[PDB]
Amino acid sequence: TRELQSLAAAVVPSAQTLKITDFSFSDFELSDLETALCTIRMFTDLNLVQNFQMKHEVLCRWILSVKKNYRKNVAYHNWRHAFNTAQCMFAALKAGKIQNKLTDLEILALLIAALSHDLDHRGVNNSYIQHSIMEHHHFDQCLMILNSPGNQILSGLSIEEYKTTLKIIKQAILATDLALYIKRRGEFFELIRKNQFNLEDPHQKELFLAMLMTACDLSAITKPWPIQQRIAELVATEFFDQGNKIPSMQVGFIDAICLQLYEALTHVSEDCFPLLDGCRKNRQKWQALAEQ
Numbered sequence: 683t684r685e686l687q688s689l690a691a692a693v694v695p696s697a698q699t700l701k702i703t704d705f706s707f708s709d710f711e712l713s714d715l716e717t718a719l720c721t722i723r724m725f726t727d728l729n730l731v732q733n734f735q736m737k738h739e740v741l742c743r744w745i746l747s748v749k750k751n752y753r754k755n756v757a758y759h760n761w762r763h764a765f766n767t768a769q770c771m772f773a774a775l776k777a778g779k780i781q782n783k784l785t786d787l788e789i790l791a792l793l794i795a796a797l798s799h800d801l802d803h804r805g806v807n808n809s810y811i812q813h814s815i816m817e818h819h820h821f822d823q824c825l826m827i828l829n830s831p832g833n834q835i836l837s838g839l840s841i842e843e844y845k846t847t848l849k850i851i852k853q854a855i856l857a858t859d860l861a862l863y864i865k866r867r868g869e870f871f872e873l874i875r876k877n878q879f880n881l882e883d884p885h886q887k888e889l890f891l892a893m894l895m896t897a898c899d900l901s902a903i904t905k906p907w908p909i910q911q912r913i914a915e916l917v918a919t920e921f922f923d924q925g926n927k928i929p930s931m932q933v934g935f936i937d938a939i940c941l942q943l944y945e946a947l948t949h950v951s952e953d954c955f956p957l958l959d960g961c962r963k964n965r966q967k968w969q970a971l972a973e974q
């Protein structure tokens with residue numbers, strides 16, 4: 683109640699003041715409350731609070747419920763990673779101008795999905811505790827919080843809108859399984875190579891939303907060099923010391939997973955180039971360290 687009292691009583695600084703429009707945004711100098719304020723600003727400047735009549739204390743309570751259900755003892759898969767994934771989605775919609783290509787229900791679902799896509803993660807080396815098992819657990823945590831008393835930020839939607847938004851939320855969270863990304867990326871790439879990518883097609887729109895979620899999920903690989911070095915530290919902490927080879931592992935991850943995706947994203951919207959650009963500069967830096 684103390685944290686909710688302070689957060690509800692705060693003034694929400696603008697998007698420019700909070701720097702959440704920048705693809706190079708970082709969160710190291712922000713408190714928990716400050717990340718909650720940036721999240722409120724994300725919902726506000728996407729007109730989600732307006733078009734769906736969210737009450738202020740319900741959104742604040744929902745944000746605090748989502749943050750609380752991430753585990754601080756996990757080095758990378760924690761609330762700050764979820765907060766960063768949502769920030770990148772915001773920057774991609776605004777600075778990347780992806781907003782105009784999607785409906786309000788799609789935007790609403792992507793922001794909720796990005797914030798919720800890793801709920802109750804306990805670390806890669808704690809997989810035993812329990813077709814994308816973890817992503818189904820993540821969505822289940824997301825739905826329970828959405829249904830909790832005082833936390834129902836979707837109450838203003840009609841039953842049709844609500845059923846539609848949950849369907850998109852679920853597919854967006856399921857898309858954060860790398861296995862699903864590997865399975866479906868060939869179709870996404872082949873459509874772009876043949877100059878045949880059309881979002882008016884429902885099947886291709888869902889495929890683009892899947893790829894966009896993966897782009898935001900891994901977007902730490904695109905950050906400026908001092909930030910990426912620190913994020914790579916968190917990944918190495920979670921992988922090895924929880925539950926140097928880092929430079930070459932970062933290069934292989936960039937080659938096998940990241941480069942094509944951010945290239946495909948740039949063809950769809952040229953304003954998403956800073957993600958591809960930042961990903962390339964990090965491959966340059968990591969490869970040099972690997973060579974020593």
Ligand SMILES: O=C(O)/C=C/c1ccc2c(=O)[nH]c(Cc3cc(Cl)ccc3NCc3cccc(F)c3)nc2c1
Binds near residue numbers: 913
């Ligand atoms: O799932 C999410 O939300 C996002 C996934 C994600 C994001 C960034 C990177 C990255 O920058 N690099 C590597 C490669 C890597 C390097 C090193 Cl040194 C050690 C392990 C690995 N990958 C395995 C791994 C272990 C533990 C945590 C983890 F996230 C990934 N994979 C990443 C995976």
Ligand SMILES: [Mg+2]
Binds near residue numbers: 799800858859
């Ligand atoms: Mg995940």
Ligand SMILES: [Zn+2]
Binds near residue numbers: 763799800858899
């Ligand atoms: Zn994730």
